[PDB]
With several copies, the nearest count.
Chain A
Amino acid sequence: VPMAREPTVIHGKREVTLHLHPDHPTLFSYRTLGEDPQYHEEWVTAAVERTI
């Protein structure tokens, strides 16, 4: 199986802006590792940007 490219990270004040460049549908998910997590999951298709 192939490995997708690393997304571009842009730091901020307690924030991260991610620029995503997929060649084909890939799955992107993140969680906050505190006491009450912030679940998320999505199927990325085209070039987008996310703030987490």
Chain B
Amino acid sequence: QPGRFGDIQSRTVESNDLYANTALKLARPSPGMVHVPYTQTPSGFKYWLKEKGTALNTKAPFGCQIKTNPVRAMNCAVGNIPVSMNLPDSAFTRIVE
């Protein structure tokens, strides 16, 4: 929808196809000038930049920092980690010693 996030969309950064809906509308030129007037709803991406609101970096629970490239959540304390082990005989000590 025009004026909000995603007014123009592309399937990939290098993709040729493009879907744009910004309500571009033409108007009759004023007499005695050559200017091609037009009107258009402002960009939705610039709007989203100004009123996105909060984030997940300052909102995530359990006190774990969000990073990007790749998207991941680090040092995020929850749950238990079962551990399975298999030790050789060289680690132990004989009871006589």
Residues of A within 8 A of B (CB): 5-6, 8, 19, 21, 29, 31, 33-37, 39, 41, 47
Report chain A residues within 8 Å CB of B6. Answer: none
Residue count of chain B within 8 Å CB distance of chain A: 16
Q: 6 tightest A-B contacts by CB?
A: A33-B63, A21-B42, A29-B58, A37-B61, A5-B39, A19-B3
Q: Shortest distance in angstroms between A48's beta carbon and chain B's nearest beta carbon?
A: 10
Report chain A residues within 8 Å CB of B47. Answer: 47
Q: Are B58 and A33 closer than 8 Å at their CB atoms?
A: no
Report chain B residues within 8 Å CB of A33. Answer: 61-63
Given contacts A5-B41, A21-B42, A39-B54, contact A31 B3 (CB under 8 A): no
Q: Are A8 and B3 closer than 8 Å at their CB atoms?
A: yes
Q: Shortest distance in angstroms between A50's beta carbon and chain B's nearest beta carbon?
A: 14
Report chain B residues within 8 Å CB of A19. Answer: 3
What would be 29 A-B contacts, judged by CB atoms less than 8 Å apart?
A: A5-B39, A5-B40, A5-B41, A6-B39, A8-B2, A8-B3, A8-B41, A21-B3, A21-B41, A21-B42, A29-B58, A31-B58, A31-B59, A33-B61, A34-B61, A34-B62, A34-B63, A35-B61, A35-B62, A36-B61, A37-B59, A37-B60, A37-B61, A39-B54, A39-B58, A39-B59, A41-B54, A47-B42, A47-B47
